[PDB]
Design a protein. Structure first.
Lengths: 86, 86
């Protein structure tokens, strides 16, 4: 689970349930090659574009299929309307 | 894992996963000669240049190969543009 829409440049508090006997590993890559965190509820910083995360749980030596979420970054609001030169 | 880019002169909150039965040792030297901390999540102060840290875990008397991270210090921002003498 993500922390809702993320304003561009901000942070994500990712979260999972607690599994006894588990080691948690988080990956940026779907191929599980790029590791971003090793904790139950990591914080990922500077998210500017939509990006996904993969979660692998190792329990008593065996590994689960990666779970996953999607972090959606709100749109950049409209440039405001200001009068012509004075 | 480091705490992101570190503004020159500031601090780093280093972190690792938790290992039952482990003693944690952190080293500044790659040769594991200079010891900076003995804790799971130490704070290292006054980092001014890019510098690396090595992590050794001792479990039930046996020692792991050191893991490692890199602390990258942001650039010093540009000196601002101010008008000529008035």
């Amino acid at each position: 689970f993500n922390n809702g829409p993320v304003c561009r440049g901000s942070s994500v508090n990712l979260s999972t349930s607690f599994i006894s006997g588990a080691t948690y590993e988080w990956y940026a890559d779907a191929a599980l090659t790029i590791l971003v965190a090793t904790s139950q509820n990591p914080t990922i910083n500077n998210i500017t574009t939509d990006s996904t995360f993969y979660l692998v749980i190792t329990v008593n030596g065996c590994t689960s299929a990666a779970g996953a979420t999607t972090v959606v970054v709100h749109p950049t609001p409209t440039t405001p309307n200001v009068p012509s030169n004075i």
